[PDB]
């Protein structure tokens, strides 16, 4: 059933699993027409499919051409997400196929279940966790490859860079969710915190800066302060 705080450690066991987030698949800008009506213009999106144990990110880029002449796009987006995840599982060798897929939003359960009827042994699960994966498009290099795409494209990342050389996947996932939570609550503050000191750079093959163990603690502390402040602001407490 549903993934929550009581079964949190399951994410880091040796059963292959993927999180699927569909929140950046269908993206629009709302604007005024010449006649003063409102219209949307779609922009490129992405499916965020993450192995929380290894850090392997399967970033399927959703080019605006997939929406051309389609109706009910918010509904089609959930089915296109399910079709692309199904295609990804079928492309993987059997020993690499996930035993579970966890969807961050409940509206993905039926579309993914129907697309995965050929895989009756793969469990499709919701979660009660409020995961910040929507903030993935605040990672500069992921945003850059989505916005530059001219056609459908799958790009492979390790969202933990080289952290697993030094920390567990439990700790790497906690750092990732803290960074994305910060980016989601106050993108500018979060991004200022990460890049303020120009002596710390992002390697060409990495997404995040090359922080020492000591500098990650300081960073993690700044991100926690940003999140609590904004929460005091939001809820006048």
């Amino acid at each position: 059933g549903a993934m929550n705080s009581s079964n949190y450690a399951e994410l880091f066991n040796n059963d292959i699993k993927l999180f699927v987030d569909d929140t950046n698949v269908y993206r629009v800008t709302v604007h005024k027409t010449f006649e003063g009506n409102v219209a949307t213009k779609a922009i490129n999106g992405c499916i965020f499919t993450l192995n929380p144990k290894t850090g392997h990110l399967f970033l399927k880029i959703i080019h605006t051409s997939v929406w051309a002449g389609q109706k009910r796009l918010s509904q089609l987006a959930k089915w296109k997400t399910a079709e692309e995840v199904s295609a990804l599982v079928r492309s993987l060798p059997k020993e690499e196929q996930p035993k579970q897929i966890i969807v961050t939003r409940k509206a993905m359960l039926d579309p993914l279940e129907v697309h995965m009827l050929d895989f009756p042994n793969i469990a499709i699960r919701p979660t009660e966790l409020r995961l910040p994966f929507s903030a993935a498009m605040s990672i500069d290099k992921l945003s850059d490859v989505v916005m530059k795409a001219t056609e459908p494209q799958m790009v492979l990342f390790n969202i933990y860079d080289d952290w697993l050389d030094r920390i567990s996947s439990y700790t790497a996932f906690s750092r990732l969710t803290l960074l994305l939570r910060a980016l989601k609550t106050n993108e500018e503050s979060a991004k200022m915190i990460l890049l303020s000191d120009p002596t710390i750079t992002i390697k060409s093959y990495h997404l995040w800066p090359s922080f020492t163990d000591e500098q990650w603690i300081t960073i993690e502390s700044q991100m926690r302060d940003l999140i609590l402040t904004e929460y005091g602001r939001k809820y006048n407490v």
């Binding site: 089609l76 039926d110 579309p111 279940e113 129907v114 009827l117 050929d118």
Partner: protein
């Protein structure tokens, strides 16, 4: 007009005959039911005064043989049996009628209720859902499970309804996932109507039989089957026009007949709300929507 004689009534029991019911006291001189209309299936059903649990009964068609009821003190129930000796049977029935120890099937001449509930139901199809091939009549009770229920245990005592599952390879064509799941026309028209049932009459027959097993025995799996077969039609954008018109008539009589006090457990809120207000066919069931809104506005 046909007769189902009773050897005796040794235990106190509420006897149902189609939509009617009568109380019989322990050892009351009752010898059965006469003037049963020929041309329809019938169900005769029982609820013991001493154990209101296990409603049970027999689907039968008087054209298919001479049937009587006899209490079995070992198995503790009223059993249907066939008398193959036609002349012996007429003699027994004639005696009980002369002595007026039979109740009369109480059909009002204006009343098409039973015809309307059983229009498409055929004894030959009932005998395929309820497998007990040495008898021409079919036993049903409250606790019998469906083939689909047993998948999710005794196969001999199961209700063999047609398995319907909206999230099944049977229901979803490869590469038409979203289309076949949001519009079930393919599953209704090609898989079920053309493939399995062969025509709408057989589909309506199973739908009507599932309803009657739900209402008369409170058979939970029969209720599930009745709702599934409604939802498959309401969730199809493309349904023959005659099927929609006939479905509205079928459901109207089922809702008309349902005991007021059972609507809370026998009617699935999600299915009815979806069928009358959300579905492709939300505008196609005028009679059914009017009776549901006037008789059970709470469920909606």
């Amino acid at each position: 007009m046909n007769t189902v004689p009773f050897t005796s009534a040794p235990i106190e029991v509420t006897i149902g005959i189609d939509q009617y019911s009568f109380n019989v006291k322990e050892n009351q001189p009752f010898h059965g039911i006469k003037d049963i209309p020929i041309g329809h299936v019938h169900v005769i059903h029982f609820q013991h005064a001493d154990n209101s649990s296990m409603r049970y009964g027999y689907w039968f068609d008087c054209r298919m043989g001479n049937f009587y009821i006899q209490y079995d003190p070992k198995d503790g129930l009223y059993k249907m049996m066939e008398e193959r000796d036609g002349a012996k049977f007429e003699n027994i029935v004639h005696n009980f009628k002369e002595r007026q120890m039979m109740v009369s099937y109480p059909k009002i001449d204006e009343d098409d209720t039973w015809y309307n509930l059983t229009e498409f139901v055929q004894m030959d199809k009932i005998r395929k859902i309820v497998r007990k091939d040495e008898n021409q009549f079919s036993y049903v009770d409250s606790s019998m499970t469906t083939v689909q229920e047993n998948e999710l245990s005794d196969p001999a005592h199961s209700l063999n309804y047609t398995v319907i599952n909206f999230k099944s390879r049977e229901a979803i064509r490869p590469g038409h996932e979203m289309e076949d799941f949001l519009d079930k026309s393919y599953y209704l028209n090609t898989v079920m109507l053309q493939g399995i049932f062969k025509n709408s009459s057989n589909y309506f027959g199973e739908l009507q039989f599932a309803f009657l097993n739900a209402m008369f025995f409170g058979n939970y799996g029969s209720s599930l089957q009745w709702h599934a077969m409604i939802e498959l039609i309401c969730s199809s954008a493309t349904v023959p026009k005659h099927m929609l018109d006939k479905l509205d008539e079928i459901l109207y009589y089922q809702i008309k007949t349902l005991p007021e006090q059972y609507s809370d457990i026998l009617l699935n809120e999600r299915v009815w709300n979806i069928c009358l207000y959300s579905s492709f066919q939300k505008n196609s069931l005028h009679n059914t929507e009017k009776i549901m809104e006037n008789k059970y506005p709470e469920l909606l």
